[PDB]
Amino acid sequence: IVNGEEAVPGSWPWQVSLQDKTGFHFCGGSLINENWVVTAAHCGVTTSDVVVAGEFDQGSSSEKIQKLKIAKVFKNSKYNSLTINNDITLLKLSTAASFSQTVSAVCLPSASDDFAAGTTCVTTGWGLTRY
Amino acid sequence: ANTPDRLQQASLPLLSNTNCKKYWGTKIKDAMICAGASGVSSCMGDSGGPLVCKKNGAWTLVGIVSWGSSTCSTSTPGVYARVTALVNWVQQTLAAN
């Protein structure tokens, strides 16, 4: 995020980091329950990547984080790689996340819910702060 | 480029798809929602993470960080996967697995 600010630690408890086998953060995701993460299809997750829950400072070794194996990647069948449309994947965890103060789920909308233009929302992540 | 160690946040407004098309044209599909163009931008490495809106006291996943400006320009809108268009598939997948 360019021109954002640091979050209060633990205050976005559904936010996960997708890390490759080398430990490199390459995408975010959101817990929707103890067993499932929603992310973008274009992130290209495989069962060799790791879901990391509970992080704030990825430079710290003192946070009680959960490194969760991925059992199966469910890319939305309507995902179109050419247009990047329907850009959603579900990750089924091999073992459940343990929910806590710092690890818990985001709500999902109904298909008919209205989120009007002009509404102020929030986005979070460990993406670049400067290109 | 700068990658942060610490989790970042930003508030930002939802756009209409019609207005978003003024920036991105026919790249904008019904299963996308734009947000930003407001002095902040999602950027590389944010992809897959949440765009949440507070409704009746709870944060609800409205978007998934998807794509946008190749320089993360804060005056152009970011593009997010529109979760309302995708949630029936989420529910079907959870139910079947």
Binding site: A40 | S42, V65, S66, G68
Partner: peptide
């Protein structure tokens, strides 16, 4: 444009 670029994936994010």
């Amino acid at each position: 444009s670029w994936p994010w």
